[PDB]
Amino acid sequence: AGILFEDIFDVKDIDPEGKKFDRVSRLHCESESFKMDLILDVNIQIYPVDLGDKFRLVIASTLYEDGTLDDGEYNPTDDRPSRADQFEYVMYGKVYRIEGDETSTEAATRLSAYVSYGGLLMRLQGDANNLHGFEVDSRVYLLMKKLAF
Amino acid sequence: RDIAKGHLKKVTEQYPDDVEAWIELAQILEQTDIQGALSAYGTATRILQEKVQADVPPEILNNVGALHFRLGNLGEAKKYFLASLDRAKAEAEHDEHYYNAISVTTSYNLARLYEAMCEFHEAEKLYKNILREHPNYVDCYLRLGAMARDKGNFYEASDWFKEALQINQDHPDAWSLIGNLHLAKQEWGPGQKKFERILKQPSTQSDTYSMLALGNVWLQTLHQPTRDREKEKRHQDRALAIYKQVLRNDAKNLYAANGIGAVLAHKGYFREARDVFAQVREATADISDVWLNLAHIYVEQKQYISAVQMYENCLRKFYKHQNTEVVLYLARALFKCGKLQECKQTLLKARHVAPSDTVLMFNVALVLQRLATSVLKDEKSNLKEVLNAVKELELAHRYFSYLSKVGDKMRFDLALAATEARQCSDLLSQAQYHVARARKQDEEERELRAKQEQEKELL
Amino acid sequence: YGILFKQEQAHDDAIWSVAWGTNKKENSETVVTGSLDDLVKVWKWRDERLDLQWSLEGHQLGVVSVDISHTLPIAASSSLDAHIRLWDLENGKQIKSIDAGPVDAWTLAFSPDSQYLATGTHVGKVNIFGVESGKKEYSLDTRGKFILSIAYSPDGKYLASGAIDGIINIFDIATGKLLHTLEGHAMPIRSLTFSPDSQLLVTASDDGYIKIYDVQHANLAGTLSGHASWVLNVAFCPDDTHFVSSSSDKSVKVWDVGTRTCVHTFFDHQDQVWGVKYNGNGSKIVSVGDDQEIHIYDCP
Amino acid sequence: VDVTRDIVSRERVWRTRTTILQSTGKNFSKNIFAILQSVKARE
Numbered sequence: 001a002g003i004l005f006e007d008i009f010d011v012k013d014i015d016p017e018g019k020k021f022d023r024v025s026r027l028h029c030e031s032e033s034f035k036m037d038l039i040l041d042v043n044i045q046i047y048p049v050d051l052g053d054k055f056r057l058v059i060a061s062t063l064y065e066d067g068t069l070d071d072g073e074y075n076p077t078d079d080r081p082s083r084a085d086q087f088e089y090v091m092y093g094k095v096y097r098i099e100g101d102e103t104s105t106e107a108a109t110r111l112s113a114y115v116s117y118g119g120l121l122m123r124l125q126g127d128a129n130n131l132h133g134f135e136v137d138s139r140v141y142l143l144m145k146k147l148a149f
Numbered sequence: 150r151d152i153a154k155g156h157l158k159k160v161t162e163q164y165p166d167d168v169e170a171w172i173e174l175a176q177i178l179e180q181t182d183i184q185g186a187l188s189a190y191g192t193a194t195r196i197l198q199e200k201v202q203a204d205v206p207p208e209i210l211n212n213v214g215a216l217h218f219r220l221g222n223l224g225e226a227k228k229y230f231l232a233s234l235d236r237a238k239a240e241a242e243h244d245e246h247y248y249n250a251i252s253v254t255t256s257y258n259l260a261r262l263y264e265a266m267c268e269f270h271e272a273e274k275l276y277k278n279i280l281r282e283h284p285n286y287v288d289c290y291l292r293l294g295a296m297a298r299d300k301g302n303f304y305e306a307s308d309w310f311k312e313a314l315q316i317n318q319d320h321p322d323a324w325s326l327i328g329n330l331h332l333a334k335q336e337w338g339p340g341q342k343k344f345e346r347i348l349k350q351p352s353t354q355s356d357t358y359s360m361l362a363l364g365n366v367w368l369q370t371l372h373q374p375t376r377d378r379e380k381e382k383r384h385q386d387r388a389l390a391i392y393k394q395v396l397r398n399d400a401k402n403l404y405a406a407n408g409i410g411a412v413l414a415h416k417g418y419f420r421e422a423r424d425v426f427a428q429v430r431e432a433t434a435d436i437s438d439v440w441l442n443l444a445h446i447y448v449e450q451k452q453y454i455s456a457v458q459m460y461e462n463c464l465r466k467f468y469k470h471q472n473t474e475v476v477l478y479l480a481r482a483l484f485k486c487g488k489l490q491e492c493k494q495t496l497l498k499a500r501h502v503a504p505s506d507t508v509l510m511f512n513v514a515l516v517l518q519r520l521a522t523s524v525l526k527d528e529k530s531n532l533k534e535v536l537n538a539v540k541e542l543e544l545a546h547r548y549f550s551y552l553s554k555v556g557d558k559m560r561f562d563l564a565l566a567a568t569e570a571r572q573c574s575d576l577l578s579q580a581q582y583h584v585a586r587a588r589k590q591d592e593e594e595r596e597l598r599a600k601q602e603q604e605k606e607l608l
Numbered sequence: 609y610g611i612l613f614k615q616e617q618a619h620d621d622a623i624w625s626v627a628w629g630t631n632k633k634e635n636s637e638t639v640v641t642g643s644l645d646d647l648v649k650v651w652k653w654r655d656e657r658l659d660l661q662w663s664l665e666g667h668q669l670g671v672v673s674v675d676i677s678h679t680l681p682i683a684a685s686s687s688l689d690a691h692i693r694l695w696d697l698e699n700g701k702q703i704k705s706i707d708a709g710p711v712d713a714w715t716l717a718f719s720p721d722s723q724y725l726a727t728g729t730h731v732g733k734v735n736i737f738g739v740e741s742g743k744k745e746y747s748l749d750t751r752g753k754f755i756l757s758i759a760y761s762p763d764g765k766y767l768a769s770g771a772i773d774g775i776i777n778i779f780d781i782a783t784g785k786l787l788h789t790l791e792g793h794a795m796p797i798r799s800l801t802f803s804p805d806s807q808l809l810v811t812a813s814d815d816g817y818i819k820i821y822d823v824q825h826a827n828l829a830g831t832l833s834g835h836a837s838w839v840l841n842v843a844f845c846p847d848d849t850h851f852v853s854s855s856s857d858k859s860v861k862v863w864d865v866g867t868r869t870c871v872h873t874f875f876d877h878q879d880q881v882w883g884v885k886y887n888g889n890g891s892k893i894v895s896v897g898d899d900q901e902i903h904i905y906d907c908p
Numbered sequence: 909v910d911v912t913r914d915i916v917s918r919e920r921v922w923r924t925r926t927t928i929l930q931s932t933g934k935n936f937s938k939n940i941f942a943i944l945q946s947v948k949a950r951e
Contacts, residue, residue, distance in 0.1 A: 249914075250915045254919065267816070267836050268833045270832075285912050300793070300795070356926075396937050400940070421943065428935050501688075504711075
């Protein structure tokens with residue numbers, strides 16, 4: 001499987017401290033079932049997004065259904081099935097910091113995955129139950145698709 | 150509708166003294182997003198006051214209050230309805246437009262809102278005020294029945310519904326409500342087929358509701374140990390044929406996909422049930438059935454982490470907090486530390502509302518035995534828990550003694566009560582053995598604290 | 609009309625009942641609550657503040673009912689463990705433990721004379737145990753499905769019972785006999801209480817209707833539309849001017865006993881309220897629920 | 909009476925029983941009947 005996370009989101013605010021760059025913007029999105037925050041940064045130029053749109057974000061460790069844990073390299077000439085065939089916007093990054101509300105005695109209840117896709121950041125803040133599949137220094141994908149609803 | 154929408158999208162920007170354009174613009178957006186029609190009514194209410202001092206006709210205010218009725222502005226919609234009734238009364242000379250009908254529909258919506266406003270007395274009064282002046286009306290006479298039906302399905306509900314059918318047998322709503330009456334008591338399992346084929350005549354065809362009611366009443370016959378007799382397989386095939394037929398004529402119907410997912414799950418394809426239920430969930434997951442059907446697949450694949458939440462979401466609705474079926478589906482193969490003691494808490498929460506059920510008072514005993522054997526067999530654990538385990542086991546044994554005397558069961562006799570009794574006997578033996586271990590650990594901690602106090606005295 | 613005190617995280621588990629005194633026998637100033645976390649916390653409502661006085665434990669299962677004796681400063685607590693344990697608010701100690709086994713143990717009913725304790729039975733009877741005896745003195749022979757609610761009249765003249773199918777059983781504690789059987793409901797009756805004058809009888813069923821019947825001639829005095837949920841707890845104001853209603857929808861409406869009108873509603877509970885009770889004067893209205901927060905509602 | 913025709917001719921029913929059955933979006937049977945037939949082929 002390799003599905004490290006799966007949930008529907010919806011966008012509520014776009015660059016709230018004002019748009020800094022010209023091709024990237026902040027997406028302060030929210031969940032619908034797990035009730036988790038999202039600070040995804042998409043390329044607004046090639047993939048425009050407006051407020052109120054919903055999308056199916058799926059953090060996956062690999063793009064293959066069988067989960068063969070690809071080494072990591074660009075190989076366009078590949079006839080194997082890929083999960084990206086049903087997604088309009090796929091990215092590749094490496095989570096680098098997992099912050100949480102830990103204390104000295106009792107374990108954390110809310111974590112915060114910080115992943116950097118070569119420059120585009122995302123904070124998947126929320127409970128510490130569905131973030132068990134995130135470990136520091138590990139490659140992950142994005143695999144989002146906007147919902148027509 | 151598209152050419153109309155383009156035409157209003159042209160009339161909107163320019164201002165050739167528009168008066169009724171916003172009325173038309175709202176008249177089409179009632180099916181679409183409910184907000185746009187509200188905005189059109191908001192601007193149209195004020196556009197009717199500049200030409201002359203003419204009070205707003207009650208039809209526009211009635212429609213805007215109806216729009217707000219579906220929303221959370223129940224009080225504001227009530228004010229709209231009251232003002233609409235008061236204007237509609239003022240039309241003493243609009244006999245051609247039938248101000249009386251406008252008052253009737255406004256009061257109908259108002260009574261519906263009062264029924265929705267936790268005030269059934271006023272809604273009964275208003276619906277009766279409609280009845281006393283126009284007995285040939287169906288909807289009011291049908292809503293009074295549901296009002297009576299909350300208190301019970303044998304009160305004036307079951308009489309008023311049949312009387313409304315007797316005055317109009319060609320009304321699909323009333324006949325479907327006649328069908329709904331038999332759903333409270335499923336003793337009419339095979340017999341409800343006849344009353345559901347009354348209006349299956351070609352004149353009423355096609356009717357997806359009667360067909361899906363047949364499909365549901367045919368699915369209810371499943372979950373029986375007589376499948377090997379080539380009886381339930383035929384039932385699955387018949388229900389699947391019904392679902393295929395309602396799928397060909399209507400590909401967008403979600404209940405057909407729900408039914409085929411249900412039967413495919415019954416066929417042993419739980420891996421292939423997720424894909425079929427996926428479209429139903431993505432279309433509209435806010436239906437009570439899909440949450441439970443998907444949580445069944447999740448709890449079947451040893452995923453209680455993804456199943457307990459989906460059971461709690463179905464309970465988030467404003468209908469109840471402690472349902473028996475949801476908690477029954479909650480505890481399926483729970484064995485972990487956080488899925489046994491807390492399972493006892495939710496079982497107690499369930500049994501609190503209705504302790505008369507035998508399944509709850511069997512399951513609590515079973516989980517008590519599970520924790521008792523999880524602390525009195527391989528442990529060698531804390532001492533206070535050994536002292537509590539014997540009390541829990543004694544309560545479980547008392548429930549074992551009490552359960553054997555009950556006549557009726559969950560369609561399966563509990564004559565298998567011997568095995569847990571033998572289990573409890575051997576756990577009593579093991580607990581009497583392990584209390585000595587508890588005392589040994591007590592002595593061990595006493596000597597360690599002594600040999601630490603001596604070192605502190607040295608310092 | 610508002611909220612005076614707000615006790616956050618009053619319990620670890622959900623609270624199912626609340627008991628508060630009405631007389632001057634060291635009961636109106638102490639709040640006794642019973643929750644599913646097996647802690648009978650004796651809160652002392654002193655200095656206008658809800659302070660914990662005693663923490664009584666011992667119940668195997670969660671507390672199902674708590675009530676304070678009318679003419680006595682002691683209390684008692686029952687559960688589904690079939691071990692009804694009596695307590696004392698003067699010392700925070702246990703008086704006894706009535707083993708109403710195997711399972712036959714339900715909500716309590718303190719007699720106004722503080723001498724008998726009614727307890728529902730799964731067989732459908734209402735067992736009347738003795739406070740100072742603990743043995744089954746006499747049982748009411750009115751079978752059926754089950755007793756879901758039992759209440760004693762403030763002056764001790766009548767006694768009603770809520771069944772699982774809306775069957776009110778008007779008993780006579782003066783002689784121990786069934787007088788009337790009011791069947792104006794078809795839903796399970798959750799809780800009920802007697803009017804301070806023992807003239808009106810409110811029934812809290814699962815239909816959202818507060819049907820207030822009469823006891824003297826066993827007739828309905830009027831159908832009041834309650835909540836949209838199921839009315840869980842209901843109490844009368846000690847001065848007999850209004851009555852609160854606890855339902856299953858995070859809402860506390862104070863309905864008027866005379867005009868059948870909601871005079872005020874509270875929505876400060878994030879979860880459903882399970883228990884509501886008045887003060888000795890009727891200004892403070894204590895409330896509990898699954899929110900595990902005790903709210904003190906002041907209605908001067 | 910005329911009151912019946914007086915109301916049913918001016919009102920508008922945007923939602924009825926059958927409307928609840930179909931999803932508000934587009935979900936045809938092409939992605940449903942395919943698996944429905946594939947599951948039958950294997951048996």
